[PDB]
Ligand binder design. Structure first.
Ligand code: ADP
Ligand code: ADP
Ligand code: ADP
Ligand code: MG
Ligand code: MG
Ligand code: MG
Ligand code: MG
Lengths: 156, 104, 77, 75, 106, 72, 525, 151
């Protein structure tokens, strides 16, 4: 082909790297509050109010993050809380990991549009796999309900 | 399974799907972490056991190792993992389609 | 000639000066190689590996690479 | 990188800080325990004087800033 | 370890006496159980010196070349005459080159 | 730097090096039409490469070994 | 001499002026900066921008709309203000083309700067641009194709136009689903142009593909305490009465008695009046009652005892949309039940969307009013999806009003540039150079569109120019692979109104900016 | 990432850094400003300039010489410094051509800015300019006429 198009801007790459760094920093922040052996964080707002919490959405929205990528991750956690109510930390860590991988993907010389479509394909395949692993459950089975509730409360 | 699917593909999309799978490996590493286990060895044992066909093999913090977890009663509904994956992928796709910041 | 304040940047500057003094060429390759090594070490550390073990593995791989370079080297008159 | 407008303490630092705050609160009232204990004499920075041995009164009158020390006070 | 006992008001002289007795016992035990070789073998002495130097060096950044640096150190020390004066061992630092490029000049 | 796609070019050159045993295949920075540096006469001293690798490894080892900063 | 460079000073402190060269320099710099900022968000492969507000709330906005980008920026360059107002007016007129018109104006002003540097009087440039604009407008009008007579062909054109409009925005991921949604929503208006009849409800959570167009209607209001939560074969009465401490409008009236028994009697009379009003409302034979204003506790229980739903505080837009979707009449007097038409729908119930509850009207009679539920992962995603859907709906409504369509993908710009070049090749003087610059800007538009995708823009533009010169009038950019193709076959079409407005507004703004040779600023407040 | 646009700050107070966009923009602006300033003093109908010193002496001088105009100006743009040094060296080597060389360099850099805007790698521009310079020098040498024989 030859030399090809010359990237005159270099500023979009800087913006992408900054956004990814912010998201990865947010994930590393809320990374230690995951699982039954996780711990809670104490957050003090502008006033004297003190919050001790393990909920990822509460941790994210309680502290002002000042970065657009971090704010979008906070909105992501809020949306996950709305639709699901738990797994608010896992989704944020997943997004941070995805963007961290996107760092090396972009550095390898891949346009940030092939990455998006490939991520969509991977998401569809992963949805298929997760549905394959799923097991049917009915509300009449109290043991499964109790196990789910206990698993939810294990990390608090 | 996504590593296998990436191996079934070709071009830059194979690399992107490989990165996707390697990013999905982060949560198991974090679960191995925070519990005193060795993350690398625990994650490798998870991968090996799942390759052997153990679909329900997971991190067992009670015994400080790896075992079946359906006997440990550690389950969550599907519309937690599915929702998290879908929302995270959509957010990442939205973030990737950004190339400038303007101060209002 | 770069006015840096970070100590690691000063270490990079001294590494370039060391490469210049010892050889005189390749003063730009060393910085890129060190940056790539530390970038990979970042994601290795994120997975829970002691940095000393990363350094030991890097030393082993460097020995292997140096031996390979000696193997594939060619002589000139 | 986190870009949070505040101060962050993580790991053994915050744990030791909380334990030190709780230890300070305990040490304030540790001298008023038991029959051989002795009362204290609080001044309200305006001339008001309070002489008491009750732990609740002492912890209520004091103005406390650290969250863990507070936790002990409301305890 | 002795901070708690201090906190109940234990007399500091008792703690000092206990430390003194424990230290005397520990020093005597160290002198008793320390391994020494009374053979005056030059090869064995060199091996012992090299092992001690390796152990003293296996905590620094030159721990990867610890055997090689320990061999240099033993060779350098064995050539001092009777006082083992530090000023008789030159240390020259020249920028550039790997650790394996470092040399000892006889 | 030469405008080529990095990952694709590197993968192709690596595959060529693996297939045919030839450690002389590199990047065609000047677009001379061949990937073999022997004919292109791209020559580097072995001492330079060895020094590069050694110095980079030692500096990385130091940077990894540091775990505290105490600036005033 | 000049006011600024005179021995005596004629201004107050803080007020200055810029003469010919300086004014032209500042205007061109501002226009080029605006064009460069708004571009790179153009075409199918354009990226979005982050608008981080510096205000106290620090509003965060991720957008691709050029008009919104230019709206929320602190602009001090007056020519930049002209361009921003152009973009806003373009958005007001039609939903799309804001980025296109802004970039075209910026490129025109860049060409004007080059011509001025080439020692050409600006009036000559303006005359040449007027002639070129006339020629380009004639060519575009001659290139328009109309398909409104054929129902199926018009529907296909609507789908193509919606897809082309949504190609650049974030909804390009689910372009097919969103295009079908937008086309159905617009077609449900039955020819009416009021986009206010289409309500977009943004509910957080869920994938962007979970968005859907409700078959009936959705309301975000509540129901009385003792009223049914589900009715079948509803007979709806929409009203705009008070029913809240309803006072007789004689403002000077008062109760003036000499005993508390009389006060109690008057209070009972007031309650009786309210009960009589409720009875008159019920005389219409209704199942569900919707009031624009508040409904107090007494009418609430009066409706509850009658088993009648009473939805309160549905604002003017709410009652208008309910009247449109159900066919009822917004009534404020109930002395003539036979003169009032009641809206009808098959089912009214409460649905569970996200964590919120909404009232769902199913099987509506008229249905000339739509509600669209948008599900997203972030608030920014929801806002951008709403803006993109608004753009698509605006363009579709314009196409419904005027069915003439032109081919996109740079085909229209290439045809305009070809016509302008043909005109310029038979004109003496420097006006020919001015028209050549006009054509250069018109060609630069698809050049930027191609650059945004990373393709060889110069080669593609040369191929397109050659094809248009040969006679291929439908050739355009194919961004599936990065070649040229037939826009008719590939189904990239745009509204003729949007392209005409873009061309004319860009030419007008370039003309008005170019005429300026002196900028005088008063002392800032 | 970038040296300046990173969460950690790697510079002393007052140190700056401009990446590709900013570096090219500043270089082109400085070069074009220098070229525009020194031009209009070119050709038989060129005009002169007034150089007013801001120091204590406040030395006054009018000149048509490009080298003297470029010497006695406070210049902060580094590319402008490059062009000023070019003009001074040209004056040192030969007496004339100080304005022409600066104008030619400014026009070349303006064309380079246009080419970069057209998404052309600067190395390709440099190679093409080297070929063009070789051809132009050959043509100019072939066009030269010598009259040193006849007095
Ligand atoms: N007893 C347990 N043993 C092993 N893993 C567990 C146990 N309880 C919870 N987990 C895991 O911990 C992960 C994190 O859950 P949690 O810490 O509650 O945060 P979130 O609910 O936001 O993901 C879950 O994905 C779950 O699989
Ligand atoms: N699928 C496509 N193929 C080629 N060109 C397209 C396509 N979709 C949109 N375009 C072009 O992109 C240009 C800009 O459209 P867009 O960015 O959506 O809104 P605006 O007109 O406000 O910039 C249009 O002129 C259109 O010709
Ligand atoms: N009589 C003339 N007719 C046409 N061109 C001329 C004449 N005299 C000078 N020039 C042109 O003017 C240009 C500028 O020369 P000048 O302004 O004297 O200084 P410099 O050569 O340093 O720019 C020269 O390149 C020359 O070709
Ligand atoms: Mg949970
Ligand atoms: Mg070199
Ligand atoms: Mg559009
Ligand atoms: Mg001259």
């Amino acid at each position: 082909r030859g030399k090809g198009a010359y990237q005159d801007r270099d500023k979009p790459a800087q913006i992408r790297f900054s956004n990814i760094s912010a998201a990865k920093a947010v994930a590393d922040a809320i990374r230690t509050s995951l699982g039954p052996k996780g711990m809670d964080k104490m957050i003090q707002d502008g006033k004297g109010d003190v919050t001790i919490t393990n909920d990822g959405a509460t941790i994210l929205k309680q502290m002002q993050v000042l970065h657009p990528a971090a704010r979008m991750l906070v909105e992501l956690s809020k949306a996950q809380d709305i639709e699901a109510g738990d797994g608010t930390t896992s989704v944020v860590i997943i997004a941070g990991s995805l963007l961290d991988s996107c760092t090396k993907l972009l550095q390898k010389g891949i346009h940030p549009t092939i990455i998006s479509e490939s991520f969509q394909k991977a998401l569809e395949k992963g949805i298929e796999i997760l549905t394959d692993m799923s097991r049917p459950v009915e509300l009449s089975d109290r043991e499964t309900l109790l196990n789910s509730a206990t698993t939810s409360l294990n990390s608090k | 399974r996504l590593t296998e699917y990436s191996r079934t593909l070709s071009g830059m999309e194979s690399y992107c799907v490989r990165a996707f799978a390697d990013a999905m490996e982060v949560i198991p590493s974090t679960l191995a972490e925070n519990a005193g286990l060795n993350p690398i060895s625990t994650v490798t044992e998870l991968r090996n056991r799942h390759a052997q066909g153990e679909k329900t093999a997971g991190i067992n913090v009670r015994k400080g190792g790896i075992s079946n977890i359906l006997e440990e009663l550690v389950v969550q509904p599907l519309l937690v993992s599915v929702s998290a994956l879908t929302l995270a992928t959509e957010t990442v796709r939205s973030i990737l389609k950004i190339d400038d910041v303007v101060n209002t | 000639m770069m006015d840096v304040d970070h100590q690691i940047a000063k270490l990079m500057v001294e590494l370039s000066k060391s490469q210049d003094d010892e050889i005189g060429d390749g003063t730009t390759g060393v910085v890129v190689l060190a940056g790539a090594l530390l970038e990979e070490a970042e994601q290795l550390l994120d997975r829970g590996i002691h940095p000393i073990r990363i350094a030991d593995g890097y030393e082993q791989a460097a020995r292997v690479a140096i031996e390979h370079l000696d193997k594939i080297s060619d002589s000139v008159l | 990188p986190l870009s949070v407008f505040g101060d962050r303490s993580t790991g053994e630092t915050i744990r030791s800080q909380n334990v030190m705050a709780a230890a300070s609160i305990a040490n304030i009232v540790k001298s008023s325990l038991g029959p051989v204990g002795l009362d204290k004499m609080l001044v309200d920075d305006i001339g008001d004087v309070t002489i008491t041995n009750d732990g609740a009164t002492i912890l209520k009158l004091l103005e406390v800033e650290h969250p863990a020390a507070k936790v002990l006070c409301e305890l | 370890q002795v901070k708690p006992y201090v906190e109940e008001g234990l007399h500091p002289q008792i703690i000092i006496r206990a430390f003194r007795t424990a230290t005397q016992l520990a020093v005597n035990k160290i002198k008793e159980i320390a391994v020494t070789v009374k053979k005056a073998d030059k090869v064995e002495q060199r091996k012992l010196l090299e092992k001690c130097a390796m152990t003293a060096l296996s905590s620094k950044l030159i721990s990867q070349q610890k055997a090689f640096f320990a061999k240099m150190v033993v060779d350098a020390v064995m050539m001092l005459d009777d006082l083992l004066q530090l000023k008789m061992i030159g240390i020259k630092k020249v920028q550039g080159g790997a650790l394996e490029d470092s040399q000892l000049v006889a | 730097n030469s405008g080529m796609n990095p990952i694709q070019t590197m993968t192709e050159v690596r595959a060529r090096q693996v297939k045919e045993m030839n450690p002389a295949l590199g990047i065609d920075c000047l677009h001379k039409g061949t990937n073999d540096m022997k004919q292109q006469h791209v020559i580097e001293t072995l001492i330079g490469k060895k020094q590069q690798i050694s110095l980079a490894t030692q500096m990385v080892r130091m940077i990894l070994k540091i775990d505290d900063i105490r600036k005033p | 001499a000049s006011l600024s460079l005179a021995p005596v000073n004629i201004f107050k402190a803080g007020a200055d002026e810029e003469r010919a060269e300086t004014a032209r320099l500042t205007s061109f710099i501002g226009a080029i900066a605006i064009g460069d900022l708004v571009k790179s968000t153009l075409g199918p492969k354009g990226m979005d921008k982050i608008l981080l507000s510096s205000g106290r709330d620090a509003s965060l906005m991720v957008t691709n709309d050029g008009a919104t980008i230019l709206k929320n920026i602190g602009v001090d360059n007056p020519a930049a203000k002209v361009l921003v107002d152009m973009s806003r007016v373009q958005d007001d007129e039609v939903g799309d083309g804001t980025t296109s018109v802004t970039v075209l104006a910026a490129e025109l002003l860049r060409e004007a700067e080059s011509l001025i540097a080439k020692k050409i009087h600006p009036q000559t440039i303006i005359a040449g641009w007027r002639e070129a604009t006339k020629a380009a407008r004639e060519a575009l009008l001659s290139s328009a194709v109309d398909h409104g007579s054929d129902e199926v062909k018009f529907r296909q054109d609507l789908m193509n136009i919606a897809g082309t409009t949504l190609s650049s925005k974030l909804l390009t991921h689910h372009k097919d689903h969103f295009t079908k949604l937008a086309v159905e929503a617009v077609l449900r208006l039955k020819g009416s142009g009021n986009l206010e009849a289409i309500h977009i409800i943004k509910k957080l959570g869920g994938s962007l593909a979970d968005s859907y167009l409700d078959e009936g209607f959705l309301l975000d209001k509540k129901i009385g305490v003792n009223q049914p939560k589900r009715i079948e074969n509803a007979k709806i009465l929409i009203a705009n009465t008070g029913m809240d401490t309803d006072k007789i409008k004689i403002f000077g009236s008062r109760v003036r008695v000499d005993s508390t028994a009389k006060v109690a009697e008057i209070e009972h009379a007031e309650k009786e009046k309210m009960k009589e009003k409720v009875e008159r409302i019920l005389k219409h034979g209704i199942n569900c009652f919707i009031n624009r204003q508040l409904i107090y506790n007494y009418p609430e229980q009066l409706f509850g005892a009658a088993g009648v739903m009473a939805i309160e505080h549905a604002d003017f837009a709410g009652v208008e949309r309910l009247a449109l979707v159900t066919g009822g009449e917004i009534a404020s007097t109930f002395d003539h039940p036979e003169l009032v038409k009641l809206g009808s729908c098959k089912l009214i119930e409460e649905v569970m969307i996200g964590e919120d509850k909404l009232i769902h009207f199913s099987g509506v009679a008229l249905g000339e009013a739509c509600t669209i539920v948008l599900r997203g992962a972030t608030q920014q995603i929801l806002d951008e999806a709403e803006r993109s859907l608004h753009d698509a709906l605006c363009v579709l409504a314009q196409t419904v009003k005027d069915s003439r369509t032109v081919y996109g993908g740079g085909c229209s710009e290439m045809l305009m540039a070809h016509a302008v070049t043909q005109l310029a090749n038979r004109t003496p003087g420097k006006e020919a150079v001015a028209m050549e610059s006009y054509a250069k800007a018109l060609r630069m538009l698809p050049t930027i569109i191609a650059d945004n995708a990373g393709y060889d823009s110069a080669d593609l533009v040369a191929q397109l120019r050659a094809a248009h010169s040969e006679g291929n009038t439908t050739a355009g950019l194919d961004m599936r692979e990065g070649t040229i193709g037939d826009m008719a076959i590939l189904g990239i079409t745009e509204s003729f109104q949007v392209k005409r407005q873009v061309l004319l507004s860009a030419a007008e703004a370039a003309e008005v900016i170019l005429r300026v040779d002196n900028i005088i600023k008063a002392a800032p407040r």
